């Protein structure tokens, strides 16, 4: 039972080296029960004749596993295609000594394949490890349009979704293009301060020179690239301080031979005993059939736990990855490279001396360039936000209060001067209230700069699957916050589960709930008049509100929505006049503002107690840098009786 294998190579000197290596590795066992062999050929330019030569190798010996390498020719992607396709028809295992392209990782197009060197996707994982070292959490992922680009983006997406913090505005550019300045200029606005790139070498030089023209290689920033972005001629356009990384002992592959035969040896003596092996597919013509045991041999070889090759302990993944290969981190230390870190799977050891960042500062630079002029959005609410027209002199009434202290007012732009019907009138109004004073305190504490402007929709905003069916984009104010129209939200805004996914909330500063309003009396939600709606009494709420979602997610209460959706004023405090008009009897709304209405006005009564608990709070975009501080500030105010004093001044004396 002479078990025979083969291996094709490139330089015809590594062929002699392979012959010597295989005959030396034959000395592992010589018990005469099992023997080994080898046959080697060299490459050729034409693909079709090369594949015919592979078929000649197939017929010339009942082969067991072919091995492939790369020649010094620069035709990268056209190198390993024919052998895999031809040998896949008989489930003949193939071993790629060195090929880093992404496409081969898919076991559905090259169903028989095994690799020892990891593809370009796996190095992305290393970045994540590095990303956790210095606490960077806002990224700018820059990638090309090639299949490797999609693979890298997908790998980084799943690895981020493991911890599931965020990605930040990935943008892809076409391959082999010039003047990429448009996308870079578009993405230069964002607050993130670290970029990641993985594309072609010429594309790397082009993006390097374009960023140099746009002045992005300067101080403070840092962006790191993959493996081939710091090779070839890309160094002729690269600035100092960009991180780089390569594999420990690649592109040699002679030592890699010393691994491959090894594992296949560790395979052969473990396979010939299963039950009924007895044959590989003999012939290369006419015999239209597959090997009866191909999948078995491939699966057994895949799970092989090899002991020690030249390149450490080598295993395989579910698809044939490198399984804990090594990586060396080099720095562009004044147009050179210095090995600063060793990545072996669990971390990167900073055993080196010093790392220089693109800015020249020798300390670890953080990203998240903090802005100074925010874009604050607000909404008209009776006891919290007061809006008035201005005196044509340039502002509105500057006068003392009951106590004599000046009530501070700002100037906010905003609406169209008429909510239901008007083209637009974007005019400045004078703008003062409780939340305005709280924002004044916050700005004084944290050195802010504010430009307040109202919403155009006039509504808070819920989920709405529009007639153009798609993902339900957020409505009005929340869409303005998410799209980038606004940057921070200060208003009497509820905190609910449906909003917690995309927004980060601060600690609540005023506890409040839901309560009924009538003009006398009434009861909570128990009466049959509400269990069974009556033609006399009318129950209406504010449309596009959190209460709409609350009544749109209750199983038993669904029918009340049937009433509520029938007629509900898509309106505001204007709908308050409904209770004055004796049309709408019951108005279900938030406790604080509706209770202030009872005290300020007359003949308006609130019945019973609350039936729901929530809270107001300042919200910001997902994982904004300010959160902690802002929250802390609010809590500190709550300690000093500031909130109680504001409560007194604004809604007590009434």
């Amino acid at each position: 039972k002479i078990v025979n294998i083969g291996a094709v190579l490139s330089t015809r000197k590594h062929e002699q080296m392979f012959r010597e290596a295989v005959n030396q590795a034959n000395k592992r066992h010589g018990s005469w029960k099992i023997q080994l062999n080898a046959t080697s050929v060299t490459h050729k330019p034409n693909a079709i004749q090369m594949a015919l030569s592979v078929c000649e190798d197939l017929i010339s010996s009942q082969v067991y596993a072919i091995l492939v390498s790369h020649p010094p020719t620069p035709n990268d992607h056209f190198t390993p295609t024919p052998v895999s396709y031809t040998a896949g028809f008989y489930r003949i295992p193939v071993l790629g000594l060195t090929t880093r392209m992404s496409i081969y990782s898919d076991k559905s197009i090259h169903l028989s394949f095994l690799r020892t060197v990891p593809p370009y996707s796996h190095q992305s994982s290393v970045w994540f490890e590095m990303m956790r070292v210095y606490s960077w959490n806002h990224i700018i992922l820059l990638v090309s349009d090639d299949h490797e680009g999609r693979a890298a983006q997908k790998r980084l997406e799943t690895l981020l979704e493991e911890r599931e913090s965020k990605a930040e505005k990935v943008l892809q550019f076409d391959p082999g293009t010039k003047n990429v300045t448009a996308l870079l200029m578009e993405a230069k606005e964002l607050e993130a301060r670290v970029i990641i790139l993985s594309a072609s070498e010429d594309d790397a030089a082009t993006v390097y020179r374009a960023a140099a023209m746009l002045n992005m290689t300067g101080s403070g920033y840092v962006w790191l690239v993959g493996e081939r972005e710091i090779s070839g001629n890309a160094l002729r356009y690269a600035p100092d301080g960009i991180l780089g990384l390569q594999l420990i002992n690649g592109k040699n592959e002679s030592a890699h031979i010393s691994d491959a035969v090894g594992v296949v040896a560790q395979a052969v003596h473990e396979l010939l005993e299963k039950e009924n092996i007895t044959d590989p597919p003999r012939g290369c013509v006419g015999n239209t059939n597959i090997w009866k045991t191909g999948p078995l041999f491939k699966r057994v070889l895949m799970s092989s736990k090899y002991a020690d090759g030249v390149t450490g302990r080598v295993e395989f993944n579910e698809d044939g990855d490198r399984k804990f290969a090594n990586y060396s981190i080099m720095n562009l230390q004044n147009r050179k490279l210095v090995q600063v870190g060793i990545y072996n799977g669990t971390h990167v050891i900073p055993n080196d001396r010093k790392i220089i960042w693109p800015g020249g500062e020798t300390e670890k630079p953080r990203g998240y360039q903090m802005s100074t002029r925010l874009k604050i959005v607000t909404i008209h609410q009776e006891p919290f936000v007061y809006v008035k027209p201005t005196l044509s002199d340039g502002t509105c009434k500057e006068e003392f209060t009951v106590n004599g202290d000046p009530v501070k007012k700002v100037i906010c732009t905003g609406p169209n001067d008429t909510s239901p019907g008007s083209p637009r009138h974007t005019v400045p109004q004078c703008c003062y209230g409780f939340c305005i004073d709280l924002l004044i305190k916050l700005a004084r504490t944290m050195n802010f700069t504010y430009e307040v402007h109202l919403v155009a929709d006039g509504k808070f905003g819920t989920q709405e699957r529009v007639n153009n069916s798609n993902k339900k984009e957020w409505n009005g104010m929340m869409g303005e916050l998410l799209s980038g129209q606004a940057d921070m939200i200060v208003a009497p805004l509820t905190i609910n589960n449906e909003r917690a996914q995309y927004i980060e909330f601060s600690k609540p500063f005023k506890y409040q709930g839901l309560t009924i309003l009538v003009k006398k009396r009434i009861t909570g939600i128990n009466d049959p008049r509400l269990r069974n709606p009556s033609d006399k009494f009318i129950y209406a709420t504010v449309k596009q509100s959190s209460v709409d979602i609350y009544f749109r997610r209750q199983v038993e209460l669904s029918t009340m929505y049937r009433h509520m959706e029938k007629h509900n004023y898509e309106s505001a405090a204007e709908a308050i006049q409904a209770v004055r008009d004796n049309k709408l009897h019951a108005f279900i709304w938030d406790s604080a503002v509706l209770e202030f209405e009872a005290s300020q006005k007359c003949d308006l009564v609130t019945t019973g107690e609350l039936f729901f608990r929530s809270g107001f709070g300042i919200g910001m975009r997902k994982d904004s840098p300010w959160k902690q501080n802002v929250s802390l500030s609010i809590l500190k105010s709550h300690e000093n009786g500031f909130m109680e004093d504001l409560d007194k001044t604004w809604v007590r004396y009434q």
Partner: protein, 119 residues
């Protein structure tokens, strides 16, 4: 503490104690299991089903709620900040002095400072 948490000795007639209760060790060789049930205990139970994780309950020995003496922290906050424990549940209040050295989640029971007197 208050009925937010309840600690009881295991039922000696039946060996352990009744269900709807979580075993809890008052470690301060000193193992002697008691069983604990209450409000925050039910929250943690019901809570444990939904994220999905497995946990234990050991009571606090030194200090009640944690105050800084000569620059050291004890009690709940000490046991969490010295990495000896992950979370501190029960009757724990939120303020500025605490939240600067330990993370805090959303509130679910509101309270404050109140005054009681005779009738």
């Amino acid at each position: 503490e208050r009925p937010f948490v309840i600690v009881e000795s295991p039922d000696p007639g039946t060996g352990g104690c009744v269900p709807n209760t979580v075993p809890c060790r008052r470690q301060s060789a000193p193992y002697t299991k008691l069983c604990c049930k209450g409000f925050c205990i039910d929250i943690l139970k019901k809570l444990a089903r939904v994220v999905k994780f497995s946990y234990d309950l050991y009571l606090v020995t030194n200090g009640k709620h944690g105050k800084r003496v000569r620059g050291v922290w004890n009690g709940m906050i000490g046991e969490v900040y010295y990495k000896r424990a992950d979370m501190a549940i029960g009757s724990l209040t939120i303020n500025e002095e605490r939240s600067e050295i330990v993370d805090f989640s959303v509130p679910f029971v509101e309270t404050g400072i109140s005054v009681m007197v005779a009738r």
